[PDB]
């Protein structure tokens, strides 16, 4: 059900790396963002040169902050800012 | 140059030693970026005359055409009027390009009264399907210029020709406006053609039918003008019925049908015979529905007319019949 | 900007009171096109009904061992009498020609030294055995029942805390295990 009710709204990831920070809207839920860095081998295309990996911190109400990758964090909820 | 105040450096050098890029920066970023910085640099090189800072800096942050043309108005940039009559920014506009052809026709008036006046008129007239009143209003502005030039005969030539030529296409082709919106437009077009009734004469007896087929859908605003023209060119029963049904059959909530009842009764008297059966009968048939439009305006015709009929008996029958319908 | 101000005005009135007042005002002024922007009749239909949403939601703007234990006991005796953060009876013992092996904080025995210091403090609080001694403990089984119930209430709140923390962590772990695994992309 976590994916069967998974509304893909398509909001963005508005973050700066350089220590990764994002701004995001308030979903009004007790879920905090979950992050992970993995290999770039899963996709509906898989173009060659797949040794670069996806470090993504995803959540409910925002398009997740993902990127190449070539607790130790938190999300301030009353201020709506992820660090 | 890649930074700002390099403009002012070049200005100081040229000044002590006395550039469309400054204009490209006069039409710079949209919302309150400078709107004045390159303006001040070009306008204080030392100082000679901006003569274009006004136009470009007012087109940076419609009426930007005027924002341009008022800079060097009568004849100071008299040759730069070529650029100053332009508002293109190629996009969809409504009233703006018709107003622009009108403005270039006024520039032609100031330039020689014919040098591109009808040129711009015909240019805007060779536009897409009418379907909208901007084109009809530009062509009728050109017709107003025709009637303005005081040439009565050739002004009627232009009026007839290119105001009954829209009668082939006045409106109703395409758009997100679903109402045809040809009625009032082509009513004013017929007004400019003939039967203006306040300036020009020489309208025939068929001018009433001209106004009818000049609405061609309805004349709710111009039931008054149609009534006046019909009782002028005809002054008869057709005119009376025309005014009556003009107020009655066009629009409800009788902002038209009250004056329609008045037209029916007063005309059926002063054209069609006084105190007759026709006056009071048409009066009943017109003000049958006749809600309390203002306060109660359906008895003030028939009761008084049945009293003017001369007979106490019919006046009393109608008096009971109307007082049983006085104030509902 | 007349049509702009009209769309923004109807936008503020519909951000406050809504399309119900739209139907009302349109039935009240649908004779004239001053409400044609709140009706199907003007070009400000779309811009208007959207600007109402904007100024309502917050997008638009207003229109304008005994030995080691004894050594730890002596460490507690010195930490009970150390009266300044930089002056005490153990600053001398550290570099004063003897061994000082409980003086480390990176030693794990530092934690037992901190516990022994907490015990010396529990003896050094005036209510802990300096010059006042309360007998609600020496002859108090009723205050003892109160204290038993207080420990039990803390325990109940703590069991609730542990259950809620376990549930929250499990839900968050399931959410990471169902997080976006296909549309990996950077901005």
Curated annotation (Swiss-Prot), chain A:
Modified residues (Phosphoserine): 39
Signal peptide: none
Superkingdom as given in the UniProt entry: Eukaryota
Subunit structure: Component of the 17S U2 SnRNP complex, a ribonucleoprotein complex that contains small nuclear RNA (snRNA) U2 and a number of specific proteins. Part of the SF3A subcomplex of the 17S U2 SnRNP complex which is composed of three subunits; SF3A3/SAP61, SF3A2/SAP62 and SF3A1/SAP114. SF3A associates with the splicing factor SF3B and a 12S RNA unit to form the mature 17S U2 small nuclear ribonucleoprotein complex (17S U2 snRNP). Identified in the spliceosome 'E' complex, a precursor of the spliceosome 'A' complex. Identified in the spliceosome 'A' and 'B' complexes.
Family label: Belongs to the SF3A2 family.
Role of this protein: Component of the 17S U2 SnRNP complex of the spliceosome, a large ribonucleoprotein complex that removes introns from transcribed pre-mRNAs. The 17S U2 SnRNP complex (1) directly participates in early spliceosome assembly and (2) mediates recognition of the intron branch site during pre-mRNA splicing by promoting the selection of the pre-mRNA branch-site adenosine, the nucleophile for the first step of splicing.
Protein name: Splicing factor 3A subunit 2
Shown part of the complete sequence: 105 to 207 of 464
Swiss-Prot record, chain B:
Organism: Homo sapiens
Residues where N6-acetyllysine is found: 123
Top-level taxon of the source organism: Eukaryota
Family: Belongs to the crooked-neck family.
Role according to the record: Involved in pre-mRNA splicing as component of the spliceosome. Involved in transcription-coupled repair (TCR), transcription and pre-mRNA splicing.
Protein name: Pre-mRNA-splicing factor SYF1
Compartments where located: Nucleus
Subunit structure, interactors included: Associates with RNA polymerase II, the TCR-specific proteins CKN1/CSA and ERCC6/CSB, and XPA. Identified in the spliceosome C complex. Component of the XAB2 complex, a multimeric protein complex composed of XAB2, PRPF19, AQR, ZNF830, ISY1, and PPIE. Identified in a pentameric intron-binding (IB) complex composed of AQR, XAB2, ISY1, ZNF830 and PPIE that is incorporated into the spliceosome as a preassembled complex. The IB complex does not contain PRPF19.
Repeat positions for HAT: 72-110, 201-233, 235-269, 274-308
Gene designation: XAB2
From Swiss-Prot, chain C:
Compartments (UniProt record): Nucleus; Nucleus speckle
Residue positions where N6-acetyllysine is found in the record: 9
Expression by tissue: Ubiquitously expressed.
Site positions (Critical for binding to SF3A3): 74
SURP motif repeat residues: 6-48, 71-113
Source organism superkingdom: Eukaryota
Function: Component of the 17S U2 SnRNP complex of the spliceosome, a large ribonucleoprotein complex that removes introns from transcribed pre-mRNAs. The 17S U2 SnRNP complex (1) directly participates in early spliceosome assembly and (2) mediates recognition of the intron branch site during pre-mRNA splicing by promoting the selection of the pre-mRNA branch-site adenosine, the nucleophile for the first step of splicing.
Domain comment as written in the entry: SURP motif 2 mediates direct binding to SF3A3.
Subunit-level organization: Component of the 17S U2 SnRNP complex, a ribonucleoprotein complex that contains small nuclear RNA (snRNA) U2 and a number of specific proteins. Part of the SF3A subcomplex of the 17S U2 SnRNP complex which is composed of three subunits; SF3A3/SAP61, SF3A2/SAP62 and SF3A1/SAP114. SF3A associates with the splicing factor SF3B and a 12S RNA unit to form the mature 17S U2 small nuclear ribonucleoprotein complex (17S U2 snRNP). SF3A1 functions as a scaffold that interacts directly with both SF3A2 and SF3A3. Identified in the spliceosome 'E' complex, a precursor of the spliceosome 'A' complex.
Name this protein carries in UniProt: Splicing factor 3A subunit 1
Full-sequence range covered: 47 to 282 of 793
């Amino acid at each position: 059900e976590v994916k069967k009710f998974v509304k893909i709204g398509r909001p963005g990831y508005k973050v700066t790396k350089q220590l990764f920070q994002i701004d995001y809207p308030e979903i009004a839920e007790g879920i905090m963002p979950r992050h992970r860095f993995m290999s770039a081998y899963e996709q509906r295309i898989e173009p060659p040169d797949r040794r670069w990996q996806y470090l993504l911190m995803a959540a409910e109400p925002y398009e997740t902050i993902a990127f190449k990758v070539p607790f130790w964090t938190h999300w301030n909820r009353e201020t709506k800012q992820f660090f | 140059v890649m930074t700002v105040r390099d403009f002012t450096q070049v200005f100081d050098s040229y000044a002590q030693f006395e550039m469309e890029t400054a204009s490209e920066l006069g039409r710079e970023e949209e919302d309150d970026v400078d709107l004045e910085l390159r303006l001040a640099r070009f306008e204080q090189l030392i100082s000679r005359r901006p003569l274009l800072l006004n136009s470009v800096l007012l087109r940076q942050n419609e009426w930007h055409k005027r924002v341009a043309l008022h800079q060097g108005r009568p004849r100071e940039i008299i040759n730069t009027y070529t650029e100053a009559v332009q508002t293109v920014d190629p996009f969809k506009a409504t009233g703006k390009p018709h107003t622009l052809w009108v403005a270039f026709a006024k520039f032609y008036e100031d330039n020689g009264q014919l040098d591109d006046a009808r040129v711009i008129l015909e240019k805007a007239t060779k536009v897409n399907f009418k379907q909208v009143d901007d084109l009809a209003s530009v062509w009728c502005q050109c017709g107003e210029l025709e009637l303005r030039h005081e040439n009565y005969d050739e002004a009627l030539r232009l009026l007839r020709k290119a105001t009954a030529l829209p009668a082939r296409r006045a409106e109703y082709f395409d758009g997100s406006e679903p109402v045809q919106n040809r009625v009032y437009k082509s009513l004013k077009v017929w007004s400019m053609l003939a039967d203006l009734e306040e300036s020009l004469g020489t309208f025939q007896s068929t001018k009433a039918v001209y106004d009818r087929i000049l609405d061609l859908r309805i004349a709710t605003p111009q039931i008054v003008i149609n009534y006046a023209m019909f009782l002028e060119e005809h002054k008869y029963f057709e005119e009376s019925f025309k005014a009556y049904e003009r107020g009655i059959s066009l629009f409800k909530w009788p902002n038209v049908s009250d004056i329609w009842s008045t037209y029916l009764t007063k005309f059926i008297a002063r054209y069609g015979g006084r105190k007759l059966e026709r006056a009071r009968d048409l009066f009943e048939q017109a003000l049958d529905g006749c809600p309390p439009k203002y306060a109660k305006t359906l008895y003030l015709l028939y009761a008084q007319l049945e009293e003017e009929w001369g007979l106490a008996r019919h006046a009393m029958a109608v008096y009971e019949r109307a007082t049983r319908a006085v104030e509902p | 900007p007349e049509v702009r101000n009209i769309v923004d005005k109807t936008a503020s009135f519909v951000a406050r009171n809504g399309p119900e007042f739209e139907a009302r005002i349109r039935q009240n002024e649908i004779n004239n096109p001053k409400f044609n922007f709140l009706n199907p009749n003007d070009p400000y239909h779309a811009y208007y009904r959207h600007k109402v949403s904007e100024f309502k939601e917050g997008k638009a703007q207003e229109p304008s061992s005994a030995f080691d234990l004894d050594v730890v006991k002596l460490t507690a005796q010195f930490v009970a009498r150390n009266g300044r953060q930089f002056l005490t009876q153990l600053m001398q013992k550290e570099q004063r020609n003897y061994q000082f092996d409980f003086l480390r904080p990176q030693h794990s025995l530092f934690n037992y030294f901190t516990k022994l210091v907490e015990q010396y403090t529990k003896i050094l609080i005036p209510p802990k055995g300096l010059f006042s001694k309360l007998k609600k403990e020496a002859e108090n089984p009723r205050e003892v029942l109160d204290q038993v119930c207080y420990r039990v209430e803390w325990a109940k709140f703590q069991e609730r805390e542990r259950k809620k923390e376990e549930e929250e962590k499990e839900k968050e772990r399931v959410a990471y295990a169902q997080i976006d695994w296909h549309d990996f992309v950077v901005v």
